[PDB]
């Protein structure tokens, strides 16, 4: 949930394959923004009674509470779309099943996870763990001609001009942040953190619970930062500065690994296959975490209760439709379904202000709340400024 996310891969890799090491700042500043924003939700959940979804509901009337629910629920679907595309592409590379058919299979991948269920819930992740590590080892190995400072000269050391000027870099920049700061994790983390061991009503030493939770929230977020940098490096190394200007999608990475000279042919074919299985593996883990988050949002805003398997079906059904419509319109174009993938993360950018602002208001009222709301207010205004600028410059 940060490195096994196809939304993270496609944005970072095309962010390097098209614009070099420029967007490395955006990775850093968003990963840092994620650390801080997640810590606020952690506090919000442990301090106040319950999570962000119901907290937002307590301040809004039902009409505007549904509008907030709509925006939030769409962000959950947008993430699911990312998995649908990711799994469809994976099935196309491995089994040769066309994207239009693969997307249809994703409705019943839910059913496939129960086939994995009775084979060890620990047994399989160990294979996936080695799978991810092996694939990541390939990616690390696939980094040559690496200038030890040309990274730095744009990594963190911000070239803040093109990042906001032309739509191209700005578009990917929004996708990168939206994929690293996922709006549905704010609602999820603000409730799952209340499962830790501490006295609910009276004891304030639950700051210890916040202590552990924030440290854990910064650990995995650091790894996500490393991977995103590792993946942007990968795309830049392989596809950036080319005469043909490859966008650098999953298909490009597949044939880059499969046709890498030093990597051989038969050996290179294994690497590409392992990547495809890892891409498939990136899906089924994401849908479980996304389903629990959907429960919180719906029960928080609408105060409506339906079983997870049902909402897992409804959310998936709604996610496959725009994927299929996209495949029908552009006649199954693989580069076009990857644009929908990137766009799904750019939408997460649009939905963020509707989640960050309520998080802000709660964090400035009831005890144990933060000293400088300064670092958090400049984030929202600069955020809505950009998503509207892009939202207007395109339109």
């Amino acid at each position, epitope marked *: 949930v940060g490195y096994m996310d196809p939304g993270n891969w496609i944005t970072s890799m095309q962010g390097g394959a098209q614009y070099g090491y420029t967007l490395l700042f955006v990775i850093l500043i968003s990963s840092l923004a994620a650390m801080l924003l997640q810590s606020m939700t952690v506090r919000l959940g442990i301090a106040t009674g319950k999570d962000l979804a119901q907290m937002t509901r307590h301040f809004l009337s039902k009409p505007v509470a549904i509008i907030f629910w709509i925006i939030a629920e769409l962000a959950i679907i947008a993430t699911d779309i990312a998995e649908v595309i990711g799994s469809a592409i994976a099935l*196309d590379l491995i089994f040769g099943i066309p994207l239009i058919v693969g997307a249809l299979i994703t409705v019943f991948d839910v059913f496939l996870l129960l086939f994995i269920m009775r084979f060890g819930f620990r047994k399989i992740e160990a294979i996936v763990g080695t799978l991810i590590f092996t694939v990541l080892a390939i990616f690390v190995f696939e980094v040559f001609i690496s200038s030890p400072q040309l990274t730095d000269i744009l990594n963190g050391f911000v070239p803040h001009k093109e990042i906001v000027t032309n739509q191209g870099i700005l578009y990917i920049a929004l996708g990168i942040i939206g994929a690293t700061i996922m709006p549905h994790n704010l609602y999820l983390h603000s409730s799952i953190v209340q499962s830790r061991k501490y006295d609910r009503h009276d004891n304030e030493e639950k700051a210890q619970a916040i202590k552990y939770a924030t440290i854990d929230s910064n650990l995995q977020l650091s790894i996500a930062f490393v991977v995103n940098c590792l993946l942007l490096t990968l795309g830049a190394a392989l*596809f950036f500065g*080319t005469k*043909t200007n490859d966008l650098g999608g999953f298909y490009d990475l597949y*044939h880059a690994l499969k046709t890498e000279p030093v990597l051989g042919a038969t050996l290179g*074919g294994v690497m590409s296959t392992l990547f495809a299985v890892a891409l498939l593996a990136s899906g089924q883990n994401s849908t479980i975490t996304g389903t629990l988050a959907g429960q919180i949002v719906m029960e928080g805003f609408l105060r409506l209760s339906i079983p997870n398997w049902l909402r897992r079906l409804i959310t998936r059904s709604l996610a496959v439709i725009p994927v299929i419509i996209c495949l029908i319109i552009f006649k*199954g174009n*693989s*580069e076009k379904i990857e644009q929908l993938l990137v766009f799904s993360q750019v939408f997460l950018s649009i939905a963020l202000p509707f989640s960050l602002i309520p998080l802000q208001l709660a964090t400035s009222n009831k005890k144990l709340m933060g000293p400088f709301i300064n670092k958090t207010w400049v984030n929202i205004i600069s955020w809505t400024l950009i998503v509207i600028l892009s939202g207007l410059n395109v339109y």
Partner: nanobody
Amino acid sequence: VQLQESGGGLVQAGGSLRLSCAASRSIFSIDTANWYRQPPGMQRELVATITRDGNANYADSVKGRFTISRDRARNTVYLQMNSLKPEDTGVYYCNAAIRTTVRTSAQEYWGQGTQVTVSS
């Protein structure tokens, strides 16, 4: 690296066929592809053309019936031939711009044609 063709053969008018254009070894990308044909006693004719961005165009004699497409996963260019007429009979060739690796310059490749016979 050689361009290999398949999927042809014998079929009745009204039937359909699907030609396959792949390379002998692993390729990074087929940037451009052309499907030529040559009926008995006639000239070599361009039938289908697919571009890098995916757009395609067909001869007026074959448009609406033929469909060229790229399988990015397997780097294969297909020619879906539907509602075949007896005059579609001939030898079909595959011209394609193969890119061996990512940064390798795009070379032009041809291939030994395959026989397509629409009978009766």
